[PDB]
Amino acid sequence: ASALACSAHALNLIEKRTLDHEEMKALNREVIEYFKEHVNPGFLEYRKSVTAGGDYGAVEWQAGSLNTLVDTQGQEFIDCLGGFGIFNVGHRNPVVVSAVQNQLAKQPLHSQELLDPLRAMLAKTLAALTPGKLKYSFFCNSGTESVEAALKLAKAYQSPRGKFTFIATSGAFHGKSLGALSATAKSTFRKPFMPLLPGFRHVPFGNIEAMRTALNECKKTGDDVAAVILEPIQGEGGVILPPPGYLTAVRKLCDEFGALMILDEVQTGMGRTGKMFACEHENVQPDILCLAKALGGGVMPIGATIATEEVFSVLFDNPFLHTTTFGGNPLACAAALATINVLLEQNLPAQAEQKGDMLLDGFRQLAREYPDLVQEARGKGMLMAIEFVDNEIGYNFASEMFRQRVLVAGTLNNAKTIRIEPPLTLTIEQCELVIKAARKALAAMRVSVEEA
Amino acid sequence: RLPSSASALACSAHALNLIEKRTLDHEEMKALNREVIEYFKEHVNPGFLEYRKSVTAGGDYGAVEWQAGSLNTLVDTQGQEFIDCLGGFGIFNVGHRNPVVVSAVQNQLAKQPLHSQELLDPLRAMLAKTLAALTPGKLKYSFFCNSGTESVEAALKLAKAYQSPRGKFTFIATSGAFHGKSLGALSATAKSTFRKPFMPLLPGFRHVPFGNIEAMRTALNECKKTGDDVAAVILEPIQGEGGVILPPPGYLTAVRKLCDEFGALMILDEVQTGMGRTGKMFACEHENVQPDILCLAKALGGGVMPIGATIATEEVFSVLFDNPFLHTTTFGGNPLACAAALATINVLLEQNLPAQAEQKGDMLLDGFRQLAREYPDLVQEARGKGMLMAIEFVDNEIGYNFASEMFRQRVLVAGTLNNAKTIRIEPPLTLTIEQCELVIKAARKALAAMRVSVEE
Amino acid sequence: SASALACSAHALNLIEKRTLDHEEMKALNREVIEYFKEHVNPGFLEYRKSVTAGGDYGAVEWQAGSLNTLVDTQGQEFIDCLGGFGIFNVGHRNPVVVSAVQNQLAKQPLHSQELLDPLRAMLAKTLAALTPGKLKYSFFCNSGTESVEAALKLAKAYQSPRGKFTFIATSGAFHGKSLGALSATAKSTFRKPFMPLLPGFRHVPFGNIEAMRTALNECKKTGDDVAAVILEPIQGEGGVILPPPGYLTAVRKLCDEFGALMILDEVQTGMGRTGKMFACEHENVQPDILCLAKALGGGVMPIGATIATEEVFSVLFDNPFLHTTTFGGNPLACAAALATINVLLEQNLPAQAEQKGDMLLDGFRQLAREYPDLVQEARGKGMLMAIEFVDNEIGYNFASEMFRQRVLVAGTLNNAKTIRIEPPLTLTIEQCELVIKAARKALAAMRVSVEEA
Amino acid sequence: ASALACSAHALNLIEKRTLDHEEMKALNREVIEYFKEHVNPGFLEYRKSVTAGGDYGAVEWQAGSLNTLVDTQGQEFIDCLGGFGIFNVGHRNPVVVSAVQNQLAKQPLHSQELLDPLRAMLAKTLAALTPGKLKYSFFCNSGTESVEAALKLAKAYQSPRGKFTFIATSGAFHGKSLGALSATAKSTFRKPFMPLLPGFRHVPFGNIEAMRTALNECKKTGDDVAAVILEPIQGEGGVILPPPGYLTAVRKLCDEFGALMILDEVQTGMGRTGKMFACEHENVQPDILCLAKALGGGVMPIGATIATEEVFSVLFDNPFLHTTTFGGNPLACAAALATINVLLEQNLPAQAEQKGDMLLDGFRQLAREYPDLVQEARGKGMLMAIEFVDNEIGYNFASEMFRQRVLVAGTLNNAKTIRIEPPLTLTIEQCELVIKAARKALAAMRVSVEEA
Ligand SMILES: Cc1ncc(COP(=O)(O)O)c(CNCCCCN)c1O
Ligand SMILES: Cc1ncc(COP(=O)(O)O)c(CNCCCCN)c1O
Ligand SMILES: Cc1ncc(COP(=O)(O)O)c(C=O)c1O
Ligand SMILES: Cc1ncc(COP(=O)(O)O)c(C=O)c1O
């Protein structure tokens, strides 16, 4: 089967909007086969360990509503995965789609030679949106690129000052490209690619005592710290809330040593935590702020790295010191400008706070009833996780929830934990259903384990 | 005009309003251009305004890009229309707002633009099938991402995961090379000014002259001797940002044989040369070389979507099977980017645009080389392959003069990141024959103007 | 500006001269200063004046006086409370070591390095029997920093196939100045100009076991597992910093728990200085690898040893050329070491080190009370001691004042002005009392000096 | 036994000038035992592979004459090993022993606080002995310490100028401490200890274009080369002679790129190649010269790093930046000064030119006659090598030479090669004996490869 035939077969599929039964049965086996032969057979296996029966091979087809997804069989799922923090303003949010639609009619990608208007507008808007002295935005295409940019700003500012050491925390996830992977803390994700960047070190998350010692020792030996990088709340780490006061203490510690503070809000950002940015909870201003995922409104890929003029100015003298080819393209800018408008207009952060309190209270109730299965439920706003007693019970919860057409999934740096990350637009009724779905799942799990 | 003390909501409202405008008034344009410049100075980068001043004359620096004109042209806020010989630096291979491409994206946007990353997502599966079929020999598996630097990051990681257990950690790249600006790709990238401020980079990255098989062999052999064995060699088939440097005949074939001999992986960076630009779908098809890993981006997104693809043999890509989360990316291979790439692949094959690049590139280069002969006064030489081309001038200034002059004649050109004497000529492969003649015409006109400028 | 031959000739005649009348003395001193400036390091002249009075800066040393003194070219005798920073544990020209070196010089000073050399095998036997527990094999080299290099290389060769590559040291630590040792050495000013050093060296505060556990734990979580931990039992160049009781034992257990190797650096604390033969004997702690030098050469030869368990050292068995050095374990060096071990054990010098050390520290602690004026505190263990002063200048003055009194002391590399007191373990009881009397008059003069201003 | 006991036995053995046949047997038995149990069992296996059953046990006991050694069984060996380049003025050279004795009577080790006069004298003498602008000496204890000082000198000089990279050559042996080992090029000596110092690269020895390339590529990528380090003739590499003009072109290349040139003459130095320093064959002045081995007259361990005032001055403001504890002690200096006197008085470097040519004439003659055994013979002054067809044949030669009481040994970075590296004081008569034995060895070797 030649390339031309495949693209042709592919374009027709793209132009369909519904599938008759045989078209659907045929599409499914294609997708599985091609996943096996040309994507990654191991994904099919993972999907199996977290589902029951032929559910593993559920093929997704379209958005059903703001908060639901429909597979090729017409089956509709309430989305509690949120694409791991992407779909904050729902699937195919009308305002974001319209913005992207309109801009596509003019220009989707720019020449990168001329001044592009929306980059300017998104930079102005993010300047306005962000705390304090954060003034300048570099645009890129992803969370990991966003962090690459932050690291490079820190390096360019700090290396002429003789500081080269970066401190991150264990449990941290910061991206998978090799620069970001150097801060990313999970052993498994790191070792096969060593050596990574030199001069990266890790302290326990949420522990200012340990961090203070890290910086002190680095100073004594002339390996002075250039920057500290952390998530305000560790995402892939299993939704780990630092003790109240931590972020502020990290901020003070960085001030004292003249280290930069990098906040990775790729997952906590754009309202997910009940505020626009998680750092607004303790009102901490980083020197550099990393955004992505939800910044594209569920429609476009985009990352943004926002820093003070003091830091960002290292890119002024030679503007080509850091670039990327698609970064801040018009479609992506359109999407993010829409998203920002939607979040503020509909006060989605406050909604995240209220829906989050509600779900977590529900999950904490269920935790009380099933301590044979559940360890604890935790979270802030619409970033939640349920930790289970062990991995297999976790994988069974995800499976039982999928069976009830509610999408959930695990976290990258914590195997016992299932995240709950719905769109901030999840309705009150859907919230209750998600609780009811979790209850049935736990009851079923009791039976399955009890007999076994 | 929109206040300094403006709420985020207000800014977003203002911006959403502008997005909805199909056409700009004169006084609307005057206001928008003022905002954009101001916000560039204050929120993007004041330096990029300074740069634009150095490749334009007078007020041209403030040119604000506004929309596609036709397939091969762009229109600024003033309504001025430009023939595009820049091509988003290798992006716009099938023109601006290519109908088939825009169509696919639009169609996919109606279903689901971004995926959950949990369920099996069909356009990923399909673009992987398509690419496996579009690529030489044993290239079978694809990883999808959002840019060329991500494509290269994935390539280096694949090599690393494959070679690490075999005890090999060293990477060989070439001077002049450009592979990205993320810190991993940047280790392979070769320009001193893009690298130094960010050192230390990845350890164990070394460089040899591009085109020099003996130099490479010496690198690999010496690394073998010292127990610093080479994991992979990474190179472009033709150095783009280096200034369109073509290697000697058989070099790629030779690099392949050299990699086979040493047990190194061969990575080909076709982020710029790929998707038909140099006269074939992939530049490695000119010598018929099969790399172990092939990097794609830029033009793969049809000039509508951002996308990167990293494609490898099953033998190499299998390092990702036991643990499919070993390497991931949030947005990678999302439905929009896939639809865009599938459409682009279809367009390219259908209209035989790789063959068009050969012919239109042959025509253009030939005319450029002719201008080179007539104006040795200003021009060092003209080189290229398919629609990837360069004019090298005798100065640095002359090249900026030429850029400035061509802009004045509403033809878009720009310089290369690793060569300050070179102006690239990188038009859509859909550039009409008429538009070619105009380009040479403008090139001649500019060279003439530049000649009399000296004689002031 | 003579010829090389002419220069060497002059030097040989000087080497033959055992006495210098007033004529030769001034010519010599003038030469030595001039050549230091032009061919050695003009900066040592600056430092020396920095810690001397008037024309004390130009004190050219000439020969040993007695066990515990040095005489300069002007016939000025100094009591040695410097000890070559831990070298002269058995005094200057100790007859038993001097003799053993002459006897060996008469036979063979250096060896072929191809035939089995007896004194290397004998010394290894002797150190096996002198060292704690499973410490069995010895690698011989020429200096403290060389012995640390061998120790890093052993740990590396052992832990590399086991997948561990990170090394933990302590701040305040000093392990040598060759670039491998320098990676574990902790003083910023000694390290910075020579970076990048070896990757994967990290530092925890000395004496803080919870801090060390966190570092090992975190390195583990991220897949940068610690191969080894290196430390001095007592930090020397750091300023005689004593760990809390049980800390060394806790480091041993922590290492045991993480499967990291323990490297104990006793280059300075070893050969009796702290009251035992090895400082690790106070708590009965067995390192996997133990480093020795300085005093191991009896004050006559340069030598270092790196001693390890058969477990660790066996990495060198299959390829005995994997780690070597050219002069390492030569007959002269071994002869000196064997004589030194004999003198220490026979004359019970570590027990003496305890007694004299206590006597001296008492003395300094009393002076500390009488002069909070000038003295922060005095601390020590055995004959490894330090007086810490208020100012770094107050202290330069103490050193400079003691020098006028023909008592020799000097600073410590890591800290700003702490004076180490590291006299031969053979300091007489009477000499001890003179050192305390001198310290007193020095502080007295310094106080008067602070007024009168 | 206790440690006191052992030390006592050892001090009795040291005082013994000669051995009873039973004392000899007991000493030999105990030496092999302690080598096995306390030194390295492998070195005993190594000796076996280069001796004929039983000879491996030989325990060396004393210098015989100036050019011979005597084992415990009174067996006397002509020394063509030279302690791998140590014994240039013979064993127990009377002028060197005398010097060391006399200084030992006064003060063997310095205080490191008072100015020690022989340090001054040796640094003066070295400054006189060295080419051109070489002026300042740092004294240490070995070749590898000498290379360490050289690397640090280059580092302290070049790091403030933005240059951190080092170029060495394949085949190179520069020492085994971890800084020097970073330059030392033999795979087998390097891998188990990696990661070494970052930024060390290797080009092939004697290839000038490959070095221009490496220097220029490093300039291009911003990894500018701080120093180039090389032996004038690779020693452990198998006596590898660069083409005429190579060394000088390397010096000019360094000038061109502003890299410091470090010449490692730890083995080639002090007369061995026919000149006092091998760099004198082409009148090259490095920025930093490294010396050791024979610098201590075959009596003391000593190393020296000599540099231009321009380079060495990096240690002037803080003379404590780089030290070693025993470096430059009166004994080592006395030995070094005596050795310089002997070599100059007796015209020994020149003797090495004549004797080397004469010995290489014999070996070249033998290579003609035994092409079944010998690939080629080569040398510069008294630094010679015989390359055989196999590693095997080489081992056999070393063994046959050992039976004949002529001591030779292989080279660390070359398996087919046997070094011939005698004192420069080797007599003409002994030169003829060495050639006779080599001839005999080859004969036995031949007739015994034929009974196979
Ligand atoms: C604990 C410790 N470890 C290593 C060294 C270095 O010894 P060296 O023989 O290579 O110099 C030392 C040495 N310290 C004092 C510096 C002497 C020069 N003033 C040590 O204490
Ligand atoms: C050229 C060269 N450079 C350094 C060294 C190492 O000096 P060392 O005094 O630390 O050993 C050498 C020495 N190699 C021969 C020793 C082999 C084992 N007997 C050298 O040739
Ligand atoms: C905290 C954090 N940082 C960075 C990233 C990298 O994002 P991407 O996968 O888009 O590169 C992620 C993705 O999950 C994340 O959760
Ligand atoms: C060959 C090559 N590789 C990689 C890149 C970088 O990819 P991106 O700019 O999309 O991150 C470029 C960009 O010009 C390129 O030409």
Residue numbers in the entry:
A (entry chain D), D (entry chain B): 8 to 459
B (entry chain C): 3 to 458
C (entry chain A): 7 to 459
Which text from the study accompanies this structure?
The structure of YgjG in complex with PLP and putrescine was determined at 2.1 Å resolution. The putrescine electron density was observed in three of the four subunits in the asymmetric unit. The putrescine amino group bound the PLP at two of the three active sites. The weak putrescine electron density could be explained by partial occupancy in the binding site and/or substrate flexibility. Putrescine binding to YgjG is mediated by a number of polar and hydrophobic interactions. The substrate N2 nitrogen atom was stabilized by a hydrogen bond with Gln119*. The putrescine was also surrounded by several residues, including Phe91, Phe180, Leu419 and Thr332*, which contributed to hydrophobic interactions with the substrate.
YgjG is a putrescine aminotransferase (PATase, EC 2.6.1.82). Based on its amino acid sequence alignment, it belongs to the class III pyrodoxal-5′-phosphate (PLP)-dependent aminotransferase family, which include ornithine aminotransferase (OAT) and GABA aminotransferase (GABA-AT). The monomer comprises an N-terminal domain, a large PLP-binding domain, and a C-terminal domain.
